[PDB]
């Protein structure tokens, strides 16, 4: 592979309960005045893993909205739903 940007669109669906999780976390990181959202972890046995979400992927959009336009209230709202759309920048592993 090389340096080209590759994005991955993911749609995850699950039961609507407080016991059924996607199995991933995200972080907000600021560096030199630019904020990015990253996949912070992916549970090895979870739905997000099954769907090919990778730790270190950069989240570009959630549910058709730019990551930099997302606040914590929006994230809570979106993440509590039984389906979720993610657009991530993803890197070749090697």
């Amino acid at each position: 592979g090389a340096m080209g940007k590759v994005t991955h669109s993911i749609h995850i669906e699950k039961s609507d309960t407080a016991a059924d999780t996607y199995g991933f976390s995200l972080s907000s990181v600021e560096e030199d005045g630019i904020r990015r959202l990253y996949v912070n972890s992916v549970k090895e046995t979870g739905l997000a893993s099954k769907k090919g979400l990778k730790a270190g992927d950069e989240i570009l959009e959630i549910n058709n909205r730019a990551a930099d336009a997302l606040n914590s209230s929006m994230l809570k709202d979106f993440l509590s739903q039984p389906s979720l759309g993610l657009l991530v920048r993803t890197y070749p592993e090697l």
Binding site: T21, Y22, S25, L26, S27, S28, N40, S41, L79
Partner: peptide
């Protein structure tokens, strides 16, 4: 540093 973190 990370500002914060959410899981679902």
């Amino acid at each position: 540093t990370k500002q914060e973190e959410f899981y679902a």
